[PDB]
Amino acid sequence: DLYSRYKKLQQELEFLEVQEEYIKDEQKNLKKEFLHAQEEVKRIQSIPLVIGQFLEAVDQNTAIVGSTTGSNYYVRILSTIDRELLKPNASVALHKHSNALVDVLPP
């Protein structure tokens, strides 16, 4: 036990040692993956799009939008946009296909 605790413990030293370069590999790779998915959800946001109009926000991060055609649409808004753009009478602009908002326009 007592003197066996040394060389028994050395294997725990090595096993905790091996997590070092492993957590280096994860911390270097997953941030590269983070800018992968970050740039990939960025390039979803494309400038040709349709402009609607905002009517009401019925809960947080999900709202309704009056389209240009007058029909009201229910869209979960994108998370990066803060609560300033939840203005009820606003010039909101969704995508032409994704129909999620990139930016609102100044009147």
């Binding site: 998915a37 990939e40 959800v41 979803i44 309704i64 939008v65 029909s71 009201n72 649409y73 229910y74 869209v75 979960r76 969704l94 995508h95 296909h97 994704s98 129909n99 999620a100």
Partner: peptide
């Protein structure tokens, strides 16, 4: 990106 198919839904109605 799982939500992106519901983006491809063109949103939803009221």
């Amino acid at each position: 990106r799982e939500e992106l198919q519901l983006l491809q839904e063109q949103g939803s109605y009221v």
